[PDB]
Amino acid sequence: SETSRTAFGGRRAVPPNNSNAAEDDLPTVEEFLNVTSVHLFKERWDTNKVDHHTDKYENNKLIVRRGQSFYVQIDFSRPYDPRRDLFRVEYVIGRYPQENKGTYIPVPIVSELQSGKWGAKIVMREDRSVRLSIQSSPKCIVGKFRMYVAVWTPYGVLRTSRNPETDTYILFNPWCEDDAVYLDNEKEREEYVLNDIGVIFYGEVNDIKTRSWSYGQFEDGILDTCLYVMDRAQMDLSGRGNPIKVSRVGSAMVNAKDDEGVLVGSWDNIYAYGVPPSAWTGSVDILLEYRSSENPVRYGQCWVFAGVFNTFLRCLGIPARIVTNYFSAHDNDANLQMDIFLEEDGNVNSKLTKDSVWNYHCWNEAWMTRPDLPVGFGGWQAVDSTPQENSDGMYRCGPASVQAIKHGHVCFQFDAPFVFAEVNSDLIYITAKKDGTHVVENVDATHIGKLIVTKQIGGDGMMDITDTYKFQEGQEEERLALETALMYGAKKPLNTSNVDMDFEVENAVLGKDFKLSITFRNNSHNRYTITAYLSANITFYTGVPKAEFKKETFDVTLEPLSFKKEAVLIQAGEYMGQLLEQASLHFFVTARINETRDVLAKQKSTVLTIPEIIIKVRGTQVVGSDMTVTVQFTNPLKETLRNVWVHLDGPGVTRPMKKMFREIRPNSTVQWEEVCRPWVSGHRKLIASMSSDSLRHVYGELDVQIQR
Amino acid sequence: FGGRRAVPPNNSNAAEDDLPTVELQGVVQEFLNVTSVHLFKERWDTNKVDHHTDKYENNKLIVRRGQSFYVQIDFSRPYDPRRDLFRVEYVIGRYPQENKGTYIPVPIVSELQSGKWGAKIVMREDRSVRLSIQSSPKCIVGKFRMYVAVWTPYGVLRTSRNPETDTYILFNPWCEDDAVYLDNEKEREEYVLNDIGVIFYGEVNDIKTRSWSYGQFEDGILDTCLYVMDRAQMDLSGRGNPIKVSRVGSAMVNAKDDEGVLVGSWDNIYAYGVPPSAWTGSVDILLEYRSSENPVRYGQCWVFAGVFNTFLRCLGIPARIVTNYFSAHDNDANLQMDIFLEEDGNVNSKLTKDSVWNYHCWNEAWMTRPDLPVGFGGWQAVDSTPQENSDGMYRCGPASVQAIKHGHVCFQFDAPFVFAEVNSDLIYITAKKDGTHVVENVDATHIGKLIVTKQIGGDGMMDITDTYKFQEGQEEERLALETALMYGAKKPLNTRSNVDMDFEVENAVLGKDFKLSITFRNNSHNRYTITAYLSANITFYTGVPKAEFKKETFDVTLEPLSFKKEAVLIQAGEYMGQLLEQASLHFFVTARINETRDVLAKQKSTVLTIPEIIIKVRGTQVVGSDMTVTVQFTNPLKETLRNVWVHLDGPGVTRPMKKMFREIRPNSTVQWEEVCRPWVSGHRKLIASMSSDSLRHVYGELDVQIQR
Ligand SMILES: [Ca+2]
Numbered sequence A: 001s002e003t004s005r006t007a008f009g010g011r012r013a014v015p016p017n018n019s020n021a022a023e024d025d026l027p028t029v030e031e032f033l034n035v036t037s038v039h040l041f042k043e044r045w046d047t048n049k050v051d052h053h054t055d056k057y058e059n060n061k062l063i064v065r066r067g068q069s070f071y072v073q074i075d076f077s078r079p080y081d082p083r084r085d086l087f088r089v090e091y092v093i094g095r096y097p098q099e100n101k102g103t104y105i106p107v108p109i110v111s112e113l114q115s116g117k118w119g120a121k122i123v124m125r126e127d128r129s130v131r132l133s134i135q136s137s138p139k140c141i142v143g144k145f146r147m148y149v150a151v152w153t154p155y156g157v158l159r160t161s162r163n164p165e166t167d168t169y170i171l172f173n174p175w176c177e178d179d180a181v182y183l184d185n186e187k188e189r190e191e192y193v194l195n196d197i198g199v200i201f202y203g204e205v206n207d208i209k210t211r212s213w214s215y216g217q218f219e220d221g222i223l224d225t226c227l228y229v230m231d232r233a234q235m236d237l238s239g240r241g242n243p244i245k246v247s248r249v250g251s252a253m254v255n256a257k258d259d260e261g262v263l264v265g266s267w268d269n270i271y272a273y274g275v276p277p278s279a280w281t282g283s284v285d286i287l288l289e290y291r292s293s294e295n296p297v298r299y300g301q302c303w304v305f306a307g308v309f310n311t312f313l314r315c316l317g318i319p320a321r322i323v324t325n326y327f328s329a330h331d332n333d334a335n336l337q338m339d340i341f342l343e344e345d346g347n348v349n350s351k352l353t354k355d356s357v358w359n360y361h362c363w364n365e366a367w368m369t370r371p372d373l374p375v376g377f378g379g380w381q382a383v384d385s386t387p388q389e390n391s392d393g394m395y396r397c398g399p400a401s402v403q404a405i406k407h408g409h410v411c412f413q414f415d416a417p418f419v420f421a422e423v424n425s426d427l428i429y430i431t432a433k434k435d436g437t438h439v440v441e442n443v444d445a446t447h448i449g450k451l452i453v454t455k456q457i458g459g460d461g462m463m464d465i466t467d468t469y470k471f472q473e474g475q476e477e478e479r480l481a482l483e484t485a486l487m488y489g490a491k492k493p494l495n496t497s498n499v500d501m502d503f504e505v506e507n508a509v510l511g512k513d514f515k516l517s518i519t520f521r522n523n524s525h526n527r528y529t530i531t532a533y534l535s536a537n538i539t540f541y542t543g544v545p546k547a548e549f550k551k552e553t554f555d556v557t558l559e560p561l562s563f564k565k566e567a568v569l570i571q572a573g574e575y576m577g578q579l580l581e582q583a584s585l586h587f588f589v590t591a592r593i594n595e596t597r598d599v600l601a602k603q604k605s606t607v608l609t610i611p612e613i614i615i616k617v618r619g620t621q622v623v624g625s626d627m628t629v630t631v632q633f634t635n636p637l638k639e640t641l642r643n644v645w646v647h648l649d650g651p652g653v654t655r656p657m658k659k660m661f662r663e664i665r666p667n668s669t670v671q672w673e674e675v676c677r678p679w680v681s682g683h684r685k686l687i688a689s690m691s692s693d694s695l696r697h698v699y700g701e702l703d704v705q706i707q708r
Numbered sequence B: 001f002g003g004r005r006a007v008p009p010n011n012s013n014a015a016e017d018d019l020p021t022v023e024l025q026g027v028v029q030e031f032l033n034v035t036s037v038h039l040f041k042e043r044w045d046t047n048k049v050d051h052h053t054d055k056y057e058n059n060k061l062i063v064r065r066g067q068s069f070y071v072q073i074d075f076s077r078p079y080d081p082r083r084d085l086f087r088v089e090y091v092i093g094r095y096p097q098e099n100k101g102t103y104i105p106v107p108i109v110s111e112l113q114s115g116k117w118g119a120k121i122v123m124r125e126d127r128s129v130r131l132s133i134q135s136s137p138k139c140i141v142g143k144f145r146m147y148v149a150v151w152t153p154y155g156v157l158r159t160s161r162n163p164e165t166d167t168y169i170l171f172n173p174w175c176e177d178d179a180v181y182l183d184n185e186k187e188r189e190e191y192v193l194n195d196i197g198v199i200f201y202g203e204v205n206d207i208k209t210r211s212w213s214y215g216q217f218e219d220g221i222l223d224t225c226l227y228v229m230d231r232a233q234m235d236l237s238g239r240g241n242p243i244k245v246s247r248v249g250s251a252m253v254n255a256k257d258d259e260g261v262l263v264g265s266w267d268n269i270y271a272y273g274v275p276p277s278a279w280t281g282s283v284d285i286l287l288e289y290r291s292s293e294n295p296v297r298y299g300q301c302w303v304f305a306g307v308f309n310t311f312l313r314c315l316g317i318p319a320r321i322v323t324n325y326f327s328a329h330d331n332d333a334n335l336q337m338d339i340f341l342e343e344d345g346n347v348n349s350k351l352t353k354d355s356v357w358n359y360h361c362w363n364e365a366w367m368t369r370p371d372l373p374v375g376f377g378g379w380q381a382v383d384s385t386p387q388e389n390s391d392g393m394y395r396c397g398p399a400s401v402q403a404i405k406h407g408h409v410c411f412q413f414d415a416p417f418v419f420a421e422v423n424s425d426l427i428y429i430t431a432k433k434d435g436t437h438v439v440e441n442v443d444a445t446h447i448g449k450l451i452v453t454k455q456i457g458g459d460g461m462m463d464i465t466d467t468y469k470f471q472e473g474q475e476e477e478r479l480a481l482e483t484a485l486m487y488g489a490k491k492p493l494n495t496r497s498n499v500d501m502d503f504e505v506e507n508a509v510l511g512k513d514f515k516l517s518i519t520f521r522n523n524s525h526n527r528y529t530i531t532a533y534l535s536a537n538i539t540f541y542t543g544v545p546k547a548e549f550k551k552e553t554f555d556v557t558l559e560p561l562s563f564k565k566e567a568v569l570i571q572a573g574e575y576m577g578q579l580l581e582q583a584s585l586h587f588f589v590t591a592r593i594n595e596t597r598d599v600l601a602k603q604k605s606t607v608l609t610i611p612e613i614i615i616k617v618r619g620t621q622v623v624g625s626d627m628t629v630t631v632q633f634t635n636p637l638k639e640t641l642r643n644v645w646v647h648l649d650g651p652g653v654t655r656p657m658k659k660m661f662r663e664i665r666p667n668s669t670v671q672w673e674e675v676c677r678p679w680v681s682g683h684r685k686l687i688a689s690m691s692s693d694s695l696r697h698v699y700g701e702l703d704v705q706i707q708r
């Protein structure tokens, strides 16, 4: 050194352009045409928004989709004359726009539009007006841009001044066939992009449950919040036109780390200083509270993270759906074995058995090509915003090609070995001997990833998409996929009579008793004497066990060629003080055969069916018209439920609202009437939840038809 | 309640649980009591010598995985193979579990077994038994706690907590079954055991070198590298994977907010910390990080690389620092770097905003890549200086250098970005008055033209350009580019009159005049007229320009089939008083051919050669005896220097220290003498730097033989 003074900007000549909200001031000066006014034909009934499928947003600015032409008109001081005039529209985004970064976009006047390029074609010249058909690149950056008109002269460039009224959002475009996010099915487009109401699947594989969720991607403020989310990630504006990077970054913002992303994750069941995850009714109040407070919102769990992320994708224009995997091996570290340790007597060792499978776990799928991959891997891409340990740390996983997962090609980014293990792991039943050695007893290859579902395109029904992640157990394709996976990230760390045991557990209403029966088939011609053990645990929906509420031992003598069934009754009083939110229960039935020391082992989950909220309506059901909605909850339980928060939602019918009733005494009903004034017409939906100081994960809804 | 998981993440080596000394169970006592344990852990003895761990300034036992070491257990009476069952235990974290690798029961075995933990009784004598214990070559790397446990029928008895037997287990380059296996002694010595490096800087025509203390064996460094992982909350089950250690560790090197080791800064001022130029090695950086528990100010790429290289060789991963001359950093995986040209042929500096780095340093870490197809093991590139990648602004790699060389850039991690860093082209583009842009020419040979690293057994430079890229303009290179462009590499713009141009710039001492000479080759039969421009910028080493200090333009007439030279004089006074630290200059020579409108363009950088420090020594140069070091610096400049900090360093010879001189007048010398008592014998180095309020990037060194 040897100095000229003042701090220098030596790392880069221009600061990162990583915020849509920030802006520069473009010079208005850098006889000649002069712009007197601009018309974007942006009313929601007009051609541009209707043809660009953007008429739903509650937003009065123009919003179009990339890769597709839209119409503008510029009025000038005198008629435009091609013999001496040169002008172009410009679109500009961020504080440091640059043409080579895609963030300063001069749109050239062309004779004909070209596939793939930005261009504006003069389709009409009338008096002093010119009408343009403007096409954007199908790879354009997605965000809110500033529009300008520039007039080129001999002395330099004159430009219009800043005008917020012409700010134009450009979004991804599932209808545009050259856009990465091209989805060639109108019906799929409506469901995965334009439907603002979802269903989540929960409960357990043998007692599926179904709750409704407001994505609300068209509601006021939501689109702007999705841009804000990217700004808070400091996402480079130049990567916001890549649906892969968009999904990679935005998903990383869903779970809050410190005081940085959108939702604080918590499964502690009490939720002191926030709002239970179970209470949420959709993404709207969460996203708006994030943007409003500028801090993480408390609190979420996997379906909440998935609800919000699904809103983010849909709103920006990437087709997205929520998936529910039944028996989910999360926190896998890419191992394909989950260990259950037994004692020598055949009891579960609860000291060692510490890995749990989730009764269900939700994540996201986002549709896009994968031009970075060998051909064949585009389509749905699994993205799970609920973090687990991957190659980098405790983070989100994905985007991972579902097809690549299905084929074992888990070397292709991102985090595919982790999502592969989430649905393909085996249960391994291991005896931990009293000398400290370990012996493998048998392996259960059919429990994890048993069924995988998502909402149907038609209606509220369940679609089964198990076969999209995995081939059929037993056949060549499934074997080829495991063999490949084991080469590229999947691990199997442990290397891997005539008695069948199973068991069935009755589904019941919360507070009711239920039956369980155990069944033995001895096909052999020999006699067996078995000691079988029943262990029945309160658990979170994650599988995490809180308490053994019921233990039992059966002594069985098996005759040759026999079938033997054994029945027991669990009373309500054996679990009723003890249940966690979601009310799930987990059963082990494990048995050692005395003659052979063979292990038979089986597990099953159950949830108690919890009470629904009743919703009803009267009055006329008309956009711009008052209807009255009644929210009804009848406590059927003998505690007095305390601080009973009730939440009402339904996109286009009401914003999200909540009410608390200080207590609901045994068997009483509360009611809460709200006058709503729908703003969206057609088949809509009122949505409610309740959480009290104890009892929660209570839902209700009502379908309503709205006229206008 | 923790419903997210049954046991918290085991992600800190500093955390620990208590093992029960008696963990009985059952019905209802002299089974064998250990009276003491001996680890033969002295630095002259065979465990540390044969494990190559005897250089660590650390009185605990330190071994390398997958290799045997000896221990002695003295019992209260003679071990008795008839009736006794016992085992060594190794345990790490607060939540150790056997199936995660963090509780490790070591079985007494009849013979050691390759790839498995075991201990052989190799001696019995009086009450003492001697063991040979082999760790798995996949073992977690960390500081373990050691227990001995005795099985009774009722459960176990166990030694109590004893810090003196805490055992470090590191990666093992000498073990043929370790992922980090490096098959020869000369490379092991250099990339693992050598604690002094050389850093290559300057510019491709003028390679500068300076020494850097890795200091991986100095007191406290090993524990610091484990504390780095603990501040990353790195799962303990990932710390035996050298791919994940590299991936997580390098992410910790650049500080983001108040997390990470070094705050990056390129502002030439460095208020409130220490100039990146002033560090002499890693040791005081890492120890300051550890004691303050906060980021250290400040670093730039070679400093990040120096500290990362320490972290790697300290845990046992072979590692070296590479310098790439003309580096395209912040590439976004684009292979095209733009220069914008006015219509007359001058550079448009308003639009030209991307800069090539004169040099850029990163690291290579040696390991297998079993996550990748075969052939991609070996050197992996890891650049802890951030740029935009698939995820955000982060470190890049590890990326297999072989995968980069062949263009297979779909294979993790961040390979497209490292690929573009060495393979980008310069694209000269005219930006016309009417807003349109015209491509003139592409220079495919400026970026990545030389990549270098320290030689084995000397301070000389090894050219390793060939490890990253095939021969220019030949089939292998062309395939590799084609492959790259289909798996993440991008080339956004689609790409003579027989005149050639190049130029040369004399290298000069700071304060001296120097010449530049431009030559034009007319290979045609035509006579041409040219206007040529020369713009000479004061830059940072990253290529970010601060000011144009010189600007000639001139007319040339080229005769057919001929040369014409044009020489330019640059006098000292034209740059002096405007330089930035590293005293980098950059030169453009652009020329427009009048007759054809063709463009010639070329660029060069030089650096002024800056004054070396003088280091002298006297006295006995013997381990444990005093010697006097003399460090002198003469201010060569004609200005006065203010707040001159001089640093002294030399692993095994002295800790890092510094001394400030308030001012040094023109051509005046300051003198620092330090009494050092060396703790390491053999060929050593003393290393010095100087940084002032102006002048910095000033170094010296002296090699010294220290006698046993
Ligand atoms: Ca399976």
Ligand SMILES: [Ca+2]
Residues within 6 Å of the ligand: B422, B423, B424, B444, B445, B446, B447, B448, B472
């Ligand atoms: Ca090249």
